[PDB]
Each structure stands twice: as C-alpha cells, then as structure tokens.
Amino acid sequence: DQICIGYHANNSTEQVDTIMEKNVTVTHAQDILEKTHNGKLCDLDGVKPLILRDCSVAGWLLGNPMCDEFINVPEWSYIVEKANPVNDLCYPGDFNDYEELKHLLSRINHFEKIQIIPKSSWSSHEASLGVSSACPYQGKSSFFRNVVWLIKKNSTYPTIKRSYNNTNQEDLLVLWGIHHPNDAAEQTKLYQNPTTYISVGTSTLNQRLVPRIATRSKVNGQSGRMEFFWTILKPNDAINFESNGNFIAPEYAYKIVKKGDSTIMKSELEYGNCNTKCQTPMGAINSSMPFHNIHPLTIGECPKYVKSNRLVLATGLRNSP
Amino acid sequence: DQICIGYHANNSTEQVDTIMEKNVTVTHAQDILEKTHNGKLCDLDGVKPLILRDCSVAGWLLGNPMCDEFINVPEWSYIVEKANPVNDLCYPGDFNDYEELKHLLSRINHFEKIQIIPKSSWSSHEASLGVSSACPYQGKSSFFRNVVWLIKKNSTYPTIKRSYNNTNQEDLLVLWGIHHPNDAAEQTKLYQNPTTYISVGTSTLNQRLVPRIATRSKVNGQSGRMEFFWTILKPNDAINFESNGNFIAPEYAYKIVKKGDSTIMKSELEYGNCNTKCQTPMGAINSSMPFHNIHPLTIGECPKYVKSNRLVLATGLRNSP
Amino acid sequence: DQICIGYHANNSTEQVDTIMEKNVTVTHAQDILEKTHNGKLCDLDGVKPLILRDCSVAGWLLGNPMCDEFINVPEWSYIVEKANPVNDLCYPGDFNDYEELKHLLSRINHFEKIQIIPKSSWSSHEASLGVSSACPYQGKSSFFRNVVWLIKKNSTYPTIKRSYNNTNQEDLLVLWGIHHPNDAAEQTKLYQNPTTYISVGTSTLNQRLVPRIATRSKVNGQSGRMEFFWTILKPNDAINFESNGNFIAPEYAYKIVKKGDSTIMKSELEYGNCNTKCQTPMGAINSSMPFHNIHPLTIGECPKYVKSNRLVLATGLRNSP
Amino acid sequence: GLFGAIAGFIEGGWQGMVDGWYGYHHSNEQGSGYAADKESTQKAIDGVTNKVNSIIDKMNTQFEAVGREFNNLERRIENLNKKMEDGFLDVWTYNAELLVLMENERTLDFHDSNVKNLYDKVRLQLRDNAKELGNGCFEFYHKCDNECMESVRNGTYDYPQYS
Amino acid sequence: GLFGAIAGFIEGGWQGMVDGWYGYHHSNEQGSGYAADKESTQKAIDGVTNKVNSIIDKMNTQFEAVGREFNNLERRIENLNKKMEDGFLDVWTYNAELLVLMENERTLDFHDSNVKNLYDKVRLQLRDNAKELGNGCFEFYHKCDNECMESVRNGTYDYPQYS
Amino acid sequence: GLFGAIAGFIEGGWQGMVDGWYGYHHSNEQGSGYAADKESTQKAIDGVTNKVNSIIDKMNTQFEAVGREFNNLERRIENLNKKMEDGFLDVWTYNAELLVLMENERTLDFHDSNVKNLYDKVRLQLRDNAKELGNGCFEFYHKCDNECMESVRNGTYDYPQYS
Ligand SMILES: CC(=O)N[C@@H]1[C@@H](O[C@@H]2O[C@@H](C)[C@@H](O)[C@@H](O)[C@@H]2O)[C@H](O[C@H]2O[C@H](CO)[C@H](O)[C@H](O[C@]3(C(=O)O)C[C@H](O)[C@@H](NC(C)=O)[C@H]([C@H](O)[C@H](O)CO)O3)[C@H]2O)[C@@H](CO)O[C@H]1O
Ligand SMILES: CC(=O)N[C@@H]1[C@@H](O[C@@H]2O[C@@H](C)[C@@H](O)[C@@H](O)[C@@H]2O)[C@H](O[C@H]2O[C@H](CO)[C@H](O)[C@H](O[C@]3(C(=O)O)C[C@H](O)[C@@H](NC(C)=O)[C@H]([C@H](O)[C@H](O)CO)O3)[C@H]2O)[C@@H](CO)O[C@H]1O
Ligand SMILES: CC(=O)N[C@@H]1[C@@H](O[C@@H]2O[C@@H](C)[C@@H](O)[C@@H](O)[C@@H]2O)[C@H](O[C@H]2O[C@H](CO)[C@H](O)[C@H](O[C@]3(C(=O)O)C[C@H](O)[C@@H](NC(C)=O)[C@H]([C@H](O)[C@H](O)CO)O3)[C@H]2O)[C@@H](CO)O[C@H]1O
Ligand SMILES: *[C@@H]1O[C@H](CO)[C@@H](O)[C@H](O)[C@H]1NC(C)=O
Ligand SMILES: *[C@@H]1O[C@H](CO)[C@@H](O)[C@H](O)[C@H]1NC(C)=O
Ligand SMILES: *[C@@H]1O[C@H](CO)[C@@H](O)[C@H](O)[C@H]1NC(C)=O
Ligand SMILES: *[C@@H]1O[C@H](CO)[C@@H](O)[C@H](O)[C@H]1NC(C)=O
Numbered sequence A, B, C: 001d002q003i004c005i006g007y008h009a010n011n012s013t014e015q016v017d018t019i020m021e022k023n024v025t026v027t028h029a030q031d032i033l034e035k036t037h038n039g040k041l042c043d044l045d046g047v048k049p050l051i052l053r054d055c056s057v058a059g060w061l062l063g064n065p066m067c068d069e070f071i072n073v074p075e076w077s078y079i080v081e082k083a084n085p086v087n088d089l090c091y092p093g094d095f096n097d098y099e100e101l102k103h104l105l106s107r108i109n110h111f112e113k114i115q116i117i118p119k120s121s122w123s124s125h126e127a128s129l130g131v132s133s134a135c136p137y138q139g140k141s142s143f144f145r146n147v148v149w150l151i152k153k154n155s156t157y158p159t160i161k162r163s164y165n166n167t168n169q170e171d172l173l174v175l176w177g178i179h180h181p182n183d184a185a186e187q188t189k190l191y192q193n194p195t196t197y198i199s200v201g202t203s204t205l206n207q208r209l210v211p212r213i214a215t216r217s218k219v220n221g222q223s224g225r226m227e228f229f230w231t232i233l234k235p236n237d238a239i240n241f242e243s244n245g246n247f248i249a250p251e252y253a254y255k256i257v258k259k260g261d262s263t264i265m266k267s268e269l270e271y272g273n274c275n276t277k278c279q280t281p282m283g284a285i286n287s288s289m290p291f292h293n294i295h296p297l298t299i300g301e302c303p304k305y306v307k308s309n310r311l312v313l314a315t316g317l318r319n320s321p
Numbered sequence D, E, F: 001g002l003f004g005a006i007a008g009f010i011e012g013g014w015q016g017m018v019d020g021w022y023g024y025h026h027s028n029e030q031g032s033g034y035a036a037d038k039e040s041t042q043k044a045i046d047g048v049t050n051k052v053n054s055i056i057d058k059m060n061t062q063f064e065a066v067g068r069e070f071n072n073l074e075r076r077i078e079n080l081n082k083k084m085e086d087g088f089l090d091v092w093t094y095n096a097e098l099l100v101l102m103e104n105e106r107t108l109d110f111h112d113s114n115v116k117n118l119y120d121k122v123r124l125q126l127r128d129n130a131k132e133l134g135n136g137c138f139e140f141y142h143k144c145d146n147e148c149m150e151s152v153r154n155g156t157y158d159y160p161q162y163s
C-alpha cells in the first residue's frame, strides 16, 4: 500500500515565456492583451463623432461652400479628419495659429453659430460681389459663408469702423481675414485706396494688418491670397474693427457652449454606424483586457496601449507531456 | 530531551505588501516615503526667498509703483509668485518674450539696479509728465519707475538719439517700451509726429518698432497699450536708441551680479519665518527618507518625488498571530 | 567508500553585484557594456562625413569665401560641426529659421549646386561691386559666393522682377537676403530709393521684407546687417522676386538629390582616416556588446547608450576561496 | 524547477486529478484514487489571483498618447513630440513584457514550491513508518486502509499507533 | 512561504527569543531556553541592509520636475511639457512601488530560506541520533545536557559519541 | 544561498572538476575521481544562455537621443528637450542596472538550486543504503566499485540488490 503526492495535468496547449525558457506549456494561462478591433469608426458612449469627411477643420470653420454639411453641427464626442482633406482653403492662403486653434478644439464638444455682423448691414460698402471661382457652389462662384469679402461701392471704399459687444455668457470664437492682392492695379480695382490696413482690438488683442503684395503661383486658379486670423472674445468684452481696404468681415462667430474631453482623430475611415466605449483611428475596442496593441491614440475608457504582439500570464503550473 | 529550530516573533503590527499578498504583518519594517511638511514657505539654506506677494515678475522688473518693496532687492535663494498676482501691468499691454525672461531668472540669484539714462538728462524732451491714472501711487498718477514715458516739449518732439556703453564686466538686463495710442488725434497730442518709430541696436539686436493704432477695450480705465521689450546687453557692447515718438526710455537697467540655481515657485502661501534645506510650494521638508509625495517641483537637497501614498520595505520576517 | 555531490570552482576573479551582496566572485561572467572607442571621427559604412572644420552650416550654405572647400560637396554619411565655428556669417546678421533648416539637413545626404540666376544676367543693375571687407578672400574684399549683392547702376536702381521655374524633378533649397543699412544716407548711397522692399512669392510663400534702419555696434568691422531667408521650392513651381532696393539675389540654389538618415554632430575633433559602423562625437565604436557608455548621440548600427560604469552578468556560480 | 518537485523527483502530473492543483493518490487492497488537497490549492489560487490583479493595477496608470499638430516650420518640436511619445511607449512596453516574463517564472516556481511543501508535510508525518520511494510516493510498512489514508490527508496520521 | 519553514512546518515564531531572528530552543532535565544563532542572523542583517541601500541608491538618480511658463498661444508645447513631466512621474512611481512589492516578497522568502537552512544544518548533524518530530524539533535518544545542547549549537555535535 | 547547498552544507567547489558545473566525486579501493553530471549542467547552460539573450533583446529597443538645435530665445524648449533626453537615459540606465542586479541574484540561486536537486536525486536513490555525512557525501554500507558508482551516476542504483 502507498500514498503519493502529485500535481495536476491536462490537455492544455497554452504556452508562456519566462526569462530562462520560452514556449513553456502550462495547464492554465491568462491572456491580458486585446489584439482585435471591429475596424469601424463608431459612436462613443452613444454620442456621434463629427466626421468632416473630405472637409478640413479650416474648411468647416470658415464655412467653405463644400462643407455645407457642417453648418450648425450637433455636439460631438470626438472629431475625425483625413490626412489630406481636399476641401480645405478653397481660395489659397494661410490660417494663422491653425494648430493652436485645433488644439483648442480638443477641449470643445459643441459650437453654436451666431450672427454678429449682418451681411445686409454693410450699407456703405458692397458685400454681395465678394466671391471667386476658387470657391465654387452649384456651378457658380461663391466664398467662405461665415465671412464677407467686402469691396468698394460706386468706386469708393470708405473707412469701416465696427464694434461688437459679447453679451452672451460664453467665450466666442471670432474669425476674420485679410486679402493679399496680386498687384497695385488690383488693389485699386477692388478697394481703390493704395495703402490699406485692418486694425482689430479687444481687451487683449492689439492687431494691425497690412496687405503684402507679391507675384505668386496660381493655386486653385488664383494667385491672390487670403490670410485668416482668429481670437476668443470673452464675455462682456467687445471687438473693434477698423479698415480702409482688403477686409474680410465676420458674418458669423461660433459660440462655445460645451467644453469637454474631445480629440481630433486622423483617419481615412468613414462611419460604421456602431457604438463603443473605446475608439481608435483603426476601429473601436470592446474588451475587458488591461492592455491592447491596436493604436496609441485612443479616446474613452480604454485599456493601456503597448507595442507587444503577445502578453500571456501563467496562472497554472507546468503541464506534462 | 529536545532541541528546536525557530524564528523571532514580536508585538509589531507593521504591515507590508507583496505581489501575492497584501497587508502582511512583519516583525520589522522601514518606511521610505516622507509624507509630511511644515506647511510654510521658508528660507533655503538660511538664504531668504524673494516673495513678490501680490506683485508679478513684470510688476517688479518694470518698477510698478505698488512694488516699491522690490526696488534694490537683496539676493534670493528662490522666487515666489502667486497664480494670479493683481499688481502686474498697471498700464495695460504686453510683455514681449516674458516667459523666456522668466526662464532666464531661473539661472539668476541677484540683480543690482543701476541708472543708465538719467531722467534729468532729457533736456530736449518733457520727462516728468509721463504718468497715468492706471498706475496710481499715494492717490496720485504715477508710472513704472524704471522707465520714462517721454512726451513733446513746447509742442515739438525732436528725434532722440541715445547710446549706452556697458562698461561693467557683467551682462545687463535692459528694459524699454513703446506706447500704442488710441487714435490719430492722441498720437499728435502726445508726440505730434503722425508717423513714428523706435529703432534699437546692439551687436546682436536689430529692432525697429512702430505704433499700431486700434480701438481697444478699457483695461484699468485705459484703452491705450504699452508693449515692453528687453535684451541682455553684454559687457563692452553698446545699445543705441533712435525715436521720433512713442518711446518709453530706460531710466534703470538691472545688473546680473550672481548666476546660480534658482526657481520661480508658484504659491499662494506667504512666509513662515523658518529655515529649510528642501522647499516645496506646499511647504518645507525635513527628513532623511529617500522619497516623498508632497509636490513634484522642489528646490534644494530633496528626496525624490513619487505619487505613492505608501512605501514600506520589509526588513524583518512574517510576524505570527 | 563514498560518493559526493559538488560544484565547479576555478581561478577566476571576476565579480558581480546583486541586491543583497556586492563584489561576489563568480566562476564565469559576461560583460555587456562597451567601455572603449578609438578616439577618432571616422567614415561611416565607408561613406565619409562632411567635416566643415572651422566653417558653420550657414558659412557653407551661403558660400562664405573661407568655405571654398565646401563648394559642390560630395555626399556625406553625417555632418561634423564645431561648437563655435569662426567662419560663420562673415558679414554680420541673422539667418532666419536657421535651426529649422539645420533640422532639415538631418534628412539630407547630398546637395547638388545649380545656377538659377546668372550673375551676368543683371544687365540693368551693377552686380560685381557688392563686396565687403568683412568677407575677405585672398587679401581682397569678397562676399558670400552663392548670392549677389546688387547695387544701383549710374545712380539708378530700377525695380527688379525675376522669376524662376523649378523644372528639375527635385525639391530645391533657395537662399536669398536683405541688407539693413546704417543710416538714410547709406540707403540712398547704395540703392538711392529711400523706401524699399523685397517681395518673394511661391505657391506657398507670401513674403515682403523691408529694411530696418538702426545704429548698431561694429561686428567684423561693419555696423550694417544682412538677414538671410530660405525656402524649399517644390518641382514645377516658380519663385518670384520683386525689389526696388536692398536685395541679395540668389546666384546658386542647392538641389536635394538624396534624402536619407543623417545627423549634424557637434565635435571639436578632426578626421582619423578610419572606417566604422557606429560613430560618436567622442570617437567610433567597434563592439558586439549590447550596451555602451561613450556618448548618447550616435549614428549607425550601435549598441544602446547607458550611463553605467559597469554592467556584468553572472553566467557561472559563486566561486570558492 | 527551483524546488525540484514538478518535472523533478515527481516526473509528471496527473490527468486523473481534476478537482485541484495538488493532491494525493492512494492505492491499497480496497482500491485507488485521487484526492485534491484543498488547503494548498486554495492558497495557490489566492496567490495567483492577487498577482494578476497586482500586475493589472500597477499598469493601470501609465502614459497615454495625445494628438498634437505642428506646421511646416515647427519640425523640431514635432520631432521632440514624436520621440517623447514613442519613448514612453517603449518604456511601458518593456515594463509590461519584463514583468510578465519575471512573474511567469515566479509563478511556475511557486507551484513547484507548493508541491514540495505538501510532499514534505506528508514525509514529516510518516517519518520511518513508510519507505520513501524517490518518486513522490510513500510505501507503508503497515497495511493502510482508506481511513488510514484519510489520516495522512487529514494531517492526523497517528505515528505512535503504527510504530 | 517558498521554503516551507516559516508558518509552515514551524507553525509560529517565538516571542521568547529577543536577541536574534533565528535560533534554538532546548528543553532537558536542567531546564529550557532560547539561544539566538548569531551567524545566520548577522548574515540576514547584512543582506537586508545592503538591499535597502541598493534600493535607495538606484532611485537616488531619477527625474526632477522643473517649472516652465508658456503664454496663451503656446498651448501645444505647454501640454507637451505637462505630459512629459507627468509621464516620468508615472514611470518612476511605478518603478518604486513595483520594486518594493517584488523585493518585499523576496525578503520574506529570504527569511524563510534562512530558517530552513538552519533547520537542515542541525538535522544533518544529528542524523539518526534524534527523532525528527515534524514541527522544527528534534527529540534525542540520549539524554542531552546543556553542554550536549551547546555542541549542536556549536556545529560540533559529536555523532560518533552518542551513536 | 537560498537553497543551502553552495557555500552551505557543501562548503566549497572543486578545482578538480573542469568538464562541468555540477557533478560527483567518488572514492573507493580502486581509486577516486570527478565526473561531471551532463544533464544538470546542460540544463544550466541552456537556462543562462536564454536569460542573457532575453536580457539583451528586451533592452534592444530603447530610447535613442537626437541632436536638436534651438536659438537664444528658445531656452524653454531647449531645456524641455534636455530634460526629456536626460530623463529617458536615467529610466533606461536604471532598468539595465536593476535587471542585472536582480537576475544576477537569481542566477546564483539557480546554480544553488541545481546542486541541491542533484544532491537530493542521489539521496533519494541511496535511501538507507548509505550514511548521509552532512557535507554532500554519502558513505556506503556496502563496498561500492566503479560500476556501483556508475549506477548512482546513471540514476540506475539498484537499492534492492544492496539492501
Ligand atoms: C487672358 C486674360 O487676360 N484674361 C482676363 C482675366 O485674367 C487672366 O485670365 C484668367 C482666366 C487667368 O488665366 C489669369 O492668367 C489672368 O488673371 C480676367 O480676370 C481673371 O483673372 C483675375 C486675376 O488677374 C482673377 O483671377 C479673376 O477671377 C476672379 C475670381 O477669383 O474668380 C473673379 C472674381 O469676380 C474676383 N472677385 C472679386 C471680389 O474681385 C476675383 C478677385 O478679383 C481676385 O481673386 C483677387 O486676387 O477674381 C479672373 O476672372 C477676366 C475678367 O477680369 O478677363 C479675362 O479676359
Ligand atoms: C467725458 C470726457 O470726454 N472726458 C474727458 C476725458 O476723456 C474721457 O474721459 C475718461 C475719464 C474716460 O471716460 C474716457 O472714455 C474718455 O477718454 C479726458 O481724458 C481722459 O481720457 C483719455 C483718453 O482719451 C485718457 O484716458 C486720460 O487719462 C490719462 C491717464 O492715463 O490717466 C491722463 C494722463 O495725464 C495722460 N498721460 C499722458 C502722459 O499723456 C494719459 C494718456 O494721454 C493716455 O493714457 C494715452 O493713451 O491719459 C483721461 O483723463 C480728460 C482730459 O483730457 O478730459 C475729460 O473732459
Ligand atoms: C573716419 C572716416 O570717416 N573714414 C571713412 C570711412 O568711414 C568710416 O571709417 C571706417 C573705416 C570705419 O571706422 C567706420 O567707423 C566709418 O564708416 C569710409 O567708409 C568705410 O565705412 C563705411 C560705413 O560708413 C563702410 O564700412 C565701408 O566699408 C565697406 C565694407 O563693407 O567693406 C566698403 C564696401 O565697398 C561697401 N560695399 C558696398 C557694396 O557698398 C560696404 C557697404 O557700403 C556697407 O558695408 C553697407 O553697410 O562698406 C568703409 O570703407 C571710407 C571709404 O568710403 O573713407 C574713410 O575716410
Ligand atoms: C516559440 O513559439 C513561437 C510560435 O509558436 C515560434 O515562432 C518560436 O520560434 C518559438 N520559439 C522558440 C525559442 O522555440
Ligand atoms: C458691453 O460691453 C461693455 C464693455 O465695453 C460692458 O461694460 C457692458 O456691460 C456690455 N453690455 C452692454 C449691454 O452694453
Ligand atoms: C489592507 O489595509 C488597508 C488599510 O489598512 C485596507 O483599506 C485594505 O482594504 C486592505 N487590503 C486588503 C487586500 O485586505
Ligand atoms: C565702449 O564700447 C565700445 C564698443 O562700441 C568698446 O570697443 C569700448 O572699449 C568700450 N569702452 C569705452 C570706455 O568706451
């Protein structure tokens, strides 16, 4: 008669690595790395992302005519933008502190659009002929819908003095622009005054822009340039514009109703019409794992990203052959 | 008769954590995390900090009349500034490369103030009427004490040409400013000349400032702006000023006698009248521990900061019940 | 009769550290830290570094007369520049976005120089008298060879309008400059026109430079300044220059034929006439070790840098006394 | 393994023992069978559970990448940003993979230790009342019925009775 | 524990032994008492001391945060700066807490090992001249006076004399 | 050491055994000599080799410094850059030095464990057919010739023949 001491074995083929030995077969193990995703861009916590499609952030905010989808957008969980969106600045130019503005959007969940300067209000200037073939809408020449390209009326450009008081109890995103003409003849043709300026003032802002003339390559069939500027106008504070030429006036300014956690995600993917609690530019994640290896940039309640192909913890003991 | 092998037990209730088990009672242990501070801002190594109180670094350096405490300051171990000091730029404006200058102060332990341009020396201009209600001193209108707000004499602002040679064997911090008037009428009222400039030259510096006019919101009861600039003037090098208007001349320039380890600490706390060898914005530290968890930003001979609530090492063995 | 169980000993004196004990003598060990280098700057993978010697990157690229060694340079594995090269900007001034350009060079292995504007081509202006004593060559006054300092012909400076079309299927590095004169009398003496500008345009670039006048300290015997600017001109795109004064025209523009892994190494060392597969600013490395402690900044196939003085792994067992 | 029991002096595990990690196999006139040792098994289950949770919690707070945009003349800070984000990923990846490697090795040795301690526990009860075979088994000098076997499993084996 | 002595085959520690970590308890006709084993204890003291110092020194050189100020249109680099500083704190916090966890576990097992090795040291001297009780004690076949007990503590127990 | 064999109950190593890490020394009427145990030695060689390669591979992917230039009014980002690069060097230096310290300690204990397991392997074969001397040696009751010694080394020692 005898009694023996022994240990469990089973039909498991799960293997784990150690320092001294690799591919050790164990009776039980626990994978802790999430390796899969659905492959789709999804609603986060039920809240739909703002998918700009082929429009850029500039195109949306300036009101490019191709981005008519994105006038008065609903609130978003996060934003999705392509690597090289075609519908950017239709009329060629620059966007001043564009990256700093884009960074500001990471703290923003909803804009509400409001009119600060009415287009009809320009009684001393011409406001309806400020269009270009570079920004076409329905086969006809158009422009960024949120700002007004002002020109002389009856061959005279009188000085503009305009002030807006922010009576909303919100920060306000104001956008405006300056036009850079091709030559001295075009400067006079549009605004007449040879030397022009644009002065913009707030409690903080002390700006004065002058048009820089240069011979430039045609971009979108135009060698003229538009340089766009912005500010955040705090509540109870006023913005003051003065210009004798080349001024792109603000029709609409965005109102920042909600400040929350958001992100501008870079992805070529469209919309899966799904829901998730953790989103990546590759697709959405649904797992209880502590880790994943899909993509570093995620939004929501996510496991931690690692570059590993495999993370398996031994729970059981060395399994016998 | 028998002999037994056994191990120590005692009345200790100290516990330590391990991977497989938490709250294991041990006979001996060693806490390595410093958890306490005195709650006070203290002298470091006997050397008192520069506590600006409600003044900012700009207010101190420009010589704001409320910061009369900080004219000819003694050397400091470190600097203490509040999150939102009220006595900043009394007259509204900007401070150019303010953060880069503040960074320079982290390498500086002592300034000595010296006069480079005497106020009396302005024989061709008016120098004593350059004040404002925005910077009040003893119920009367004053200005930043270190710079002179120059205006026209008998309705004429002649061109200023001034040069200073740095004969000290030290780097020299020179501060000056430009004034931005409200409108064309105020420009003429103050300086008469409609178009004005300020050119500043050194071996390295090649600056030319022009006043930008704009309608601005009232800050501290004034819609005019002052924009302040600085440079480090090396020894044996000269600074050259030329201006026909809007010039805020340097009366005094700071001399950098000592360069050492320092820091600008952000704290609402005042002064404990204590001494320490390790200081935080929360308070001072006195311990032999290798670690602490008070605050990341420290100055002096300090233990290492960690986010832990508890770090206890087992020295003894598992204690019996 | 007896049988014993025992273990290896030997004459080894190699020691290793552990947590509980230091300097434990072991029978076998393995050093994993490379501690040595040859002390020389070497060819990497047979490919010679560009050693600028006493010339800087600016001096080389602008074509400073002392840097005649570096006209039409062969391709380089990496670049070597001193901490304080004497042959920098011979004529005093600034180099605009110099660090961003230097960063661009880390992606560049070969430049090919080409003429875009011929010097003879300036038929309406004087081009051969644009020299200075600050840039001497063979005892005579010279200038940066790659750009032309243009001046008035027969007391007239007519407006310059020049355009170059990039017909090469390469990005092109174009360099140009503006001259800042000492006073209004010198402005007229050189270019006659009191108020002057330089407008530069591409598909992206929209620049307009104006000379800033100031009284400046003599650097290299000159108080005048030259400010240098650059761009990358993409293929099939044109650059447009317009100026009525103070223009430093491009004679030559560099062509970027190869884009590869490169680096600007800071070192006072010269050339060992050796070859290596891993290079540091201290010298070259030849080892199979996984680690080294020579210098953090390396180029090529290198072991990993650590700050350790000693990394030895025990392979054998504790050796007996 | 370090403790010399698993794949050591006990050559292999038991497919026939399904109700535990460690236990006993008896054989006598009445029959044979496997009985899992509940105490040592539960202790092992607790230790490994805590370990997995400990491992998870330590990694729970760790670097998270954020999207930052830079223009064409901000290449240096764009590169700084990339190296910073990549650098932390490598640090945290290394931590994860190393911790798994080291603790996996400790887990296997922990199981080896538990088997050894259980073996010695029995050995120390039986003393010279059974032959130590060298394979994990003890062969009794006395006839050991199922109650006798239960006392060894109990921890209650009465040495003085069978001596 | 891994080595099976502490809270293992030796159920509990001794409140009565104050002059050391490990030692002996004798009982005979003359009396009973605790004697600390100096050698094994001092070795344990050295090992744990070095460990604590080793731990401290490795952490001694580690990231230190610095105050950096950025204006309102430098938010990207302000954020980069924050993530960099926070990231290193998490790395170094994790290192500290993990090292403590892992080395605490090794420290307890080290003590368990020392007790085991001391137990076996005695066992190997006594051989078949005493009964191994299973609880850490050895019961002698011969009467063992205080000198006899001292020889076991000595390492000098003369097996051939009492055989 | 943790397992109590190396510099423990086996006081010292053998200069005379050159063909292996662990083995046997026999002495009888015919002579004496060292024989390396191939199996335990090769297992140790494999374990330590893998460990060194594992260690190297984990460090293989790690932070690399890059040269970045900043002008005189970019001191904040120059400083940020320096701290970032220095910070990662300290993290990776610490990792390297700690890993070496911890794994060196495990390597020595691994060797100690292998000797112990080899010792017990023999002990379990011989059982009560030899005297356990307490020093790593077993003294036989029967005369043990070179074939008899070979069977102990074999794992084939026939206990029933010499019992
Ligand atoms: C061969 C020729 O001389 N054709 C002129 C044409 O000018 C040229 O032809 C065009 C088609 C290109 O091939 C160019 O080489 C050259 O410009 C005349 O006008 C065109 O060119 C001007 C620039 O010189 C403008 O590009 C203009 O387009 C608009 C536009 O953006 O769509 C028309 C629009 O109504 C204008 N809007 C406003 C508010 O002014 C703008 C604006 O003036 C500029 O964008 C500001 O820079 O320009 C082209 O139509 C045309 C009519 O003028 O006659 C051809 O015979
Ligand atoms: C109702 C009215 O017209 N009152 C004028 C007053 O101007 C107005 O009243 C002030 C109190 C505010 O309500 C404003 O809306 C309005 O300007 C006249 O001057 C005052 O206003 C000017 C701006 O236009 C200045 O703000 C001035 O203050 C000082 C100052 O900073 O304290 C006076 C000081 O002596 C001046 N110092 C120098 C060196 O020039 C400065 C300086 O000119 C400006 O700050 C430059 O931007 O202004 C107010 O006193 C006054 C006297 O002119 O008459 C009332 O009847
Ligand atoms: C005492 C006196 O009046 N001497 C003049 C000298 O001017 C002065 O002496 C020189 C040697 C220095 O001590 C200066 O303090 C002072 O200017 C006359 O010209 C020299 O000075 C001028 C500046 O005013 C220039 O510096 C000039 O040098 C060059 C140069 O760079 O080498 C000559 C060169 O041919 C010029 N090139 C072009 C394309 O114009 C440049 C250029 O005009 C400036 O660099 C632009 O900023 O200047 C010195 O020769 C001389 C002759 O004019 O006569 C002495 O009597
Ligand atoms: C371990 O297994 C993997 C996947 O099955 C295999 O690719 C790898 O080569 C194996 N490694 C070793 C060391 O056997
Ligand atoms: C408008 O702005 C001014 C500041 O310019 C503020 O004091 C005032 O309360 C605001 N509201 C109205 C209704 O005018
Ligand atoms: C350990 O102790 C702490 C505080 O004394 C307690 O809050 C915690 O729940 C305990 N942890 C476990 C796992 O029992
Ligand atoms: C003044 O500065 C000049 C440079 O402009 C320098 O060469 C000179 O030595 C300095 N010293 C005196 C006493 O002027």
Ligand SMILES: *[C@@H]1O[C@H](CO)[C@@H](O)[C@H](O)[C@H]1NC(C)=O
Pocket: C022, C023
């Ligand atoms: C270990 O050896 C080094 C170099 O020989 C010596 O300097 C050091 O003091 C020794 N360390 C200890 C703890 O004995």
Ligand SMILES: *[C@@H]1O[C@H](CO)[C@@H](O)[C@H](O)[C@H]1NC(C)=O
Pocket: A217, C165, C166, C167, C236, C237, C238
């Ligand atoms: C020159 O550049 C223009 C753009 O200005 C481009 O369209 C053209 O194809 C280029 N080639 C030639 C030969 O001019």
Ligand SMILES: *[C@H]1O[C@H](CO)[C@@H](O)[C@H](O)[C@H]1NC(C)=O
Pocket: D146, D147, D148, D150, D151, D154, D156
């Ligand atoms: C264990 O088993 C025996 C029968 O073999 C029984 O009589 C005894 O009470 C049991 N003791 C315990 C502690 O379970």
Ligand SMILES: *[C@H]1O[C@H](CO)[C@@H](O)[C@H](O)[C@H]1NC(C)=O
Pocket: E146, E147, E148, E149, E150, E151, E154, E156
């Ligand atoms: C130890 O004790 C014995 C008495 O029991 C004594 O005779 C002997 O000399 C001692 N030996 C040592 C090494 O302490």
Ligand SMILES: *[C@H]1O[C@H](CO)[C@@H](O)[C@H](O)[C@H]1NC(C)=O
Pocket: F146, F147, F148, F150, F151, F154, F156
């Ligand atoms: C071991 O040695 C014996 C002689 O002592 C021999 O008969 C036997 O075949 C050998 N067995 C093995 C496995 O080598």
